[PDB]
Amino acid sequence: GSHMVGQLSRGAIAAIMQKGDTNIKPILQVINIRPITTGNSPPRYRLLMSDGLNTLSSFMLATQLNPLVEEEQLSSNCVCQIHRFIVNTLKDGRRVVILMELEVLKSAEAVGVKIGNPVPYNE
């Protein structure tokens, strides 16, 4: 309801990427989901997520959760709680968050819009 950004864990993106906080169970909004390029393997999805202050596209989904995307329960605009995630740092220094467990709290259809005015996070 009122003040929609109050429904999101403002500051969680910075906490994850800066402080190395992996204990939080932040509530984030999905802004976009797209497949990455895969070959002979299960598909893999990349997500642009928002905590209300920042967006960040450095997220990929555990493949065990693919059905959430493919059956449309996890889609752009939905609000989700991340129950478990890990971080992998690439050779070039970029960090990637792999979402291992998450819960859809509000469906995309029940939210319907990007919440707030988040700006891209600068790693």
Ligand X SMILES: O=C(O)c1cc(-c2ccc(CNC(=S)c3ccc(-c4ccc(C(=O)O)o4)cc3Cl)cc2)n(-c2ccc(Cl)c(Cl)c2)n1
Hey, is 85 helix, strand or coil? strand
Residues 68-87, one symbol each (x = binds ligand X by CB under 6 A, - = not), give --------------------
Query: Are 12 and 24 a contacting pair, CB within 8 Å?
Result: yes
Residue in 20, 83, 88, 101 binding ligand X, rule: CB under 6 A: 88
Residue in 4, 24, 60, 105 binding ligand X, rule: CB under 6 A: 60
46 touching ligand X, by CB under 6 A = yes
45 vs 115, which CB is nearer to ligand X?
Answer: 45
98 touching ligand X, by CB under 6 A = yes
**Strand residue runs (E) in 1-123:** 27-35, 45-50, 54-61, 79-89, 95-106, 119-120
41 touching ligand X, by CB under 6 A = no
In sequence order, the 6+-apart residues with CB closer than 8 A to the CB of 69 are 33, 45, 61, 75
Amino acid occupying residue 21: D
Query: Are 43 and 66 a contacting pair, CB within 8 Å?
Result: yes
37 vs 122, which CB is nearer to ligand X?
Answer: 37
Instruction: Give the shortest CB-28-to-ligand X separation in angstroms.
Output: 14
Residue in 49, 58, 68, 80 binding ligand X, rule: CB under 6 A: 58
